[PDB]
Each structure stands twice: as structure tokens, then as C-alpha cells.
Enzyme design. Structure first.
Site, mmCIF file in Angstrom:
data_model
loop_
_atom_site.group_PDB
_atom_site.id
_atom_site.type_symbol
_atom_site.label_atom_id
_atom_site.label_comp_id
_atom_site.label_asym_id
_atom_site.label_seq_id
_atom_site.Cartn_x
_atom_site.Cartn_y
_atom_site.Cartn_z
ATOM 1 N N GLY A 16 -2.364 5.467 5.332
ATOM 2 C CA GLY A 16 -1.965 4.767 6.419
ATOM 3 C C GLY A 16 -0.594 3.889 6.379
ATOM 4 N N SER A 17 -0.376 3.123 7.345
ATOM 5 C CA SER A 17 0.815 2.001 7.196
ATOM 6 C C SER A 17 0.733 0.819 8.061
ATOM 7 C CB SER A 17 2.122 2.860 7.461
ATOM 8 O OG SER A 17 2.651 3.603 6.507
ATOM 9 N N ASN A 19 2.797 -3.535 7.933
ATOM 10 C CA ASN A 19 4.116 -4.277 7.346
ATOM 11 C C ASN A 19 4.346 -4.236 5.954
ATOM 12 O OD1 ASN A 19 2.047 -6.369 7.464
ATOM 13 N ND2 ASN A 19 3.932 -7.274 6.413
ATOM 14 N N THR A 22 3.072 1.380 2.479
ATOM 15 C CA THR A 22 1.943 2.510 2.674
ATOM 16 C C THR A 22 0.844 2.302 1.714
ATOM 17 O OG1 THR A 22 3.136 3.613 0.660
ATOM 18 C CG2 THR A 22 4.196 3.853 2.685
ATOM 19 N N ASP A 127 -9.154 -12.485 7.436
ATOM 20 C CA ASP A 127 -8.875 -11.321 7.962
ATOM 21 C C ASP A 127 -10.063 -10.250 8.227
ATOM 22 O OD1 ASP A 127 -7.450 -9.271 8.915
ATOM 23 O OD2 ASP A 127 -5.963 -9.185 7.154
HETATM 24 C C1 LIG Z 1 -5.140 -2.896 1.102
HETATM 25 C C2 LIG Z 1 -5.997 -1.442 1.121
HETATM 26 N N1 LIG Z 1 -6.634 -1.047 0.385
HETATM 27 N N2 LIG Z 1 -7.243 0.315 0.944
HETATM 28 C C3 LIG Z 1 -7.806 1.025 0.235
HETATM 29 C C4 LIG Z 1 -8.688 0.832 -0.758
HETATM 30 C C5 LIG Z 1 -9.544 1.576 -1.459
HETATM 31 N N3 LIG Z 1 -9.725 3.040 -0.686
HETATM 32 C C6 LIG Z 1 -8.908 3.384 0.273
HETATM 33 N N4 LIG Z 1 -9.119 4.389 0.902
HETATM 34 C C7 LIG Z 1 -8.702 4.902 2.146
HETATM 35 C C8 LIG Z 1 -9.140 6.176 2.434
HETATM 36 C C9 LIG Z 1 -8.606 6.551 3.650
HETATM 37 C C10 LIG Z 1 -7.968 5.790 4.693
HETATM 38 C C11 LIG Z 1 -7.401 4.632 4.208
HETATM 39 C C12 LIG Z 1 -7.747 4.090 3.027
HETATM 40 C C13 LIG Z 1 -6.643 4.207 5.206
HETATM 41 CL CL1 LIG Z 1 -5.691 2.765 5.010
HETATM 42 C C14 LIG Z 1 -6.628 5.179 6.090
HETATM 43 C C15 LIG Z 1 -5.646 4.977 7.462
HETATM 44 N N5 LIG Z 1 -7.076 6.337 5.756
HETATM 45 C C16 LIG Z 1 -7.527 7.474 6.620
HETATM 46 N N6 LIG Z 1 -8.012 2.420 0.597
HETATM 47 C C17 LIG Z 1 -6.480 0.395 1.993
HETATM 48 C C18 LIG Z 1 -5.724 -0.909 2.122
HETATM 49 C C19 LIG Z 1 -5.093 -1.115 3.637
HETATM 50 N N7 LIG Z 1 -5.751 -0.939 4.815
HETATM 51 C C20 LIG Z 1 -5.977 -1.916 5.620
HETATM 52 C C21 LIG Z 1 -7.238 -1.465 6.196
HETATM 53 O O1 LIG Z 1 -6.962 -0.607 7.424
HETATM 54 C C22 LIG Z 1 -7.232 -0.583 5.008
#
Ligand SMILES: Cc1nn(-c2ccnc(Nc3ccc4c(c3)c(Cl)c(C)n4C)n2)cc1CN1CC(O)C1
Length: 259
Positions: A16-17, A19, A22, A127
Site C-alpha cells: 500500500g501507500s 504520505n 511504501t 491513531d
Molecule cells: C506501519 C505498517 N506496518 N505494516 C505492516 C506490518 C506488518 N505486516 C503488514 N502486512 C500487510 C499485508 C497486506 C497489506 C498491508 C500490510 C497493507 Cl498496508 C496493505 C494495503 N495490504 C494489502 N503490514 C503496515 C503498515 C502501514 N499501514 C497503515 C495501515 O493501513 C497498515
């Protein structure tokens, strides 16, 4: 804490994305087995928030908080975390209607246990929302995104300095506590039982602030367990001091779940 960049591999493509930039699937090589990781890449104000974010995650150890592997300074700065495969709770519950309320009750209770832990550690999230909960499996949820988080001072219960997830005292007086996170969790619960629906649809922040100061709240979602809706309204107590803390909320959720 400080990782070797040659022992970390990424994909070309992102998940995802926002500000900050990535988030990417990657593979970090450990003592001997590889581990699948999510890495937050940075596209020195922004650099300093990241090292703060990792600093919060460093001091946190709970099964329902996302786990940090470390920081990697290379090319761009990088926060490397344990990968939660199924990803955000909203896009998931959007894309999975079949998920029975008993599952959702379980999932939001894991969050409350996570937030209980955080309250006891005197950290404020600031948040808390469905988007910032991630799913390991369909029955394992973890709290993510400590970018706005704060360690409270040993001598106060609030930090002094996203409007739809915010307690009224956050808007008027700028004070952020565990009690204000309890309000957020209220909205988080609404999102969950509404299957990933955006709270206060098509309303601007000032219209939401208007509604709440009239003593009005969001209506009960389609098919939501009734006890769970009463909990949202208690979470949304206007008064900070009569609004429950996370132990209190964690208790109700546990009690109603084994029921
Ligand atoms: C600081 C942070 N850690 N983190 C993260 C950590 C561990 N696993 C995963 N796995 C994971 C797995 C799948 C994911 C995403 C993330 C996201 Cl983002 C999307 C759009 N998809 C489909 N992601 C994701 C974030 C940022 N985003 C703010 C929220 O919408 C999540």
C-alpha cells in the site's frame, strides 16, 4: 536493532501507500531460517518520526502488538517488522462478508487486550482505527502503526500537542490519553461490526464534532450484537472521567465472548 541490508531482500512491488511512503513484503535472513517481513520504506523531519516509531515498537512486547525486527539504514531508511499476512482489518472485512460476528467479537477483544497492555505501559496510540489493525490469520489480529504514539510522562496521564476517530477532548483541548484511545476503539469496533465501512459517511470533521456535542452517536450497524453496541456508546462517553479505561473494556469483551 540495526540490520544488515544484504541479509534483507524486498519485492519490486508494494502492498500500500500513504504520505510516509511504501510498505513492502520482504525476506530477512535470521540466525539460520529466513523470516517474512513487512518493511516500511521512507520516500530529516520524516526520518525522525520513523526512528521515533521504531523506538516505541522497541519497548513493546505483546502478542497483539505488531513485532519489530529492526531498523535498516540503507539507501532509504527502513523499518522492518514481522509480517502479518492477511493485512488490514477493514479491507479484509470489506472483502469477507461471511465472517461471523463471533469472529469479530474475538478479533476486537484481541485489540482491547493489546490496548490494555499499552495503557499499562503508559503509551498512547493516538491513531487507533480498523485500518491500523492487521491480521496474522483470520483469528489473530495485531495493532499496528505507532507513528503518532507517545510515551506518557511518569507524572501525567495525557500528552498535550484523523478527526473521526478522536475523542472530543482531543479536538477542543488537544489532550491524548488512554481514555481518548478508548473512544477510538469505540469507532474501531463500529468499523469492525460494519464490515470495514467508513465511520460518519460523507461528513466533514466539524459536522462530526457538531453531532457529538448534541449527544448524538453513530447508529447500531446491521446485524451487530446488541451488547457490543452498548459498549461502543460507553466507549463514546463525552466525559473523560466517566469513560471506561481499557481494563474495564477488556473485561466486558472477555465476559461477553465466553457468553
Ligand atoms: C506501519 C505498517 N506496518 N505494516 C505492516 C506490518 C506488518 N505486516 C503488514 N502486512 C500487510 C499485508 C497486506 C497489506 C498491508 C500490510 C497493507 Cl498496508 C496493505 C494495503 N495490504 C494489502 N503490514 C503496515 C503498515 C502501514 N499501514 C497503515 C495501515 O493501513 C497498515
Amino acid at each position: 536493532v540495526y540490520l544488515d541490508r544484504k541479509l534483507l531482500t524486498l519485492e519490486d512491488k508494494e502492498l500500500g501507500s500513504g504520505n510516509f511512503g511504501t510498505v513492502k513484503k520482504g525476506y530477512y535472513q535470521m540466525k539460520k531460517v529466513v523470516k517474512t517481513v513487512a518493511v516500511k520504506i521512507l520516500k530529516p523531519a520524516l526520518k525522525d518520526e520513523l526512528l521515533a516509531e521504531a523506538n516505541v515498537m522497541q519497548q513493546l512486547d505483546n502478542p497483539y502488538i505488531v513485532r519489530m525486527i529492526g531498523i535498516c539504514e540503507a539507501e532509504s531508511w527502513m523499518l522492518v517488522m514481522e509480517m502479518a499476512e492477511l493485512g488490514p482489518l477493514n479491507k479484509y472485512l470489506q472483502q469477507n462478508r461471511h465472517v461471523k460476528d463471533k469472529n469479530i467479537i474475538e478479533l476486537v477483544h484481541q485489540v482491547s487486550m493489546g490496548m490494555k497492555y499499552l495503557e499499562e505501559s503508559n503509551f498512547v496510540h493516538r491513531d487507533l482505527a480498523a485500518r491500523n489493525v492487521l491480521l496474522v490469520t483470520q483469528h489473530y489480529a495485531k495493532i499496528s502503526d505507532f507513528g503518532l504514539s507517545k510515551a506518557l510522562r511518569a507524572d501525567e496521564n495525557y500528552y498535550k500537542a484523523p478527526v473521526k476517530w478522536y475523542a472530543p477532548e482531543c479536538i477542543n483541548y488537544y489532550k491524548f490519553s488512554s481514555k481518548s484511545d478508548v473512544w477510538s476503539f469505540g469507532v474501531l469496533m463500529w468499523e469492525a461490526f460494519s464490515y470495514g465501512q467508513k465511520p460518519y459517511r460523507g461528513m466533514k470533521g466539524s459536522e462530526v464534532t457538531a453531532m457529538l456535542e448534541k449527544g448524538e452517536r453513530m447508529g447500531c450497524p446491521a446485524g451487530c450484537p446488541r451488547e457490543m453496541y452498548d459498549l461502543m456508546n460507553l466507549c463514546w462517553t463525552y466525559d473523560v472521567e466517566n469513560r471506561p479505561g481499557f481494563a474495564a473494556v477488556e473485561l466486558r469483551l472477555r465476559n461477553y465472548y465466553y457468553d
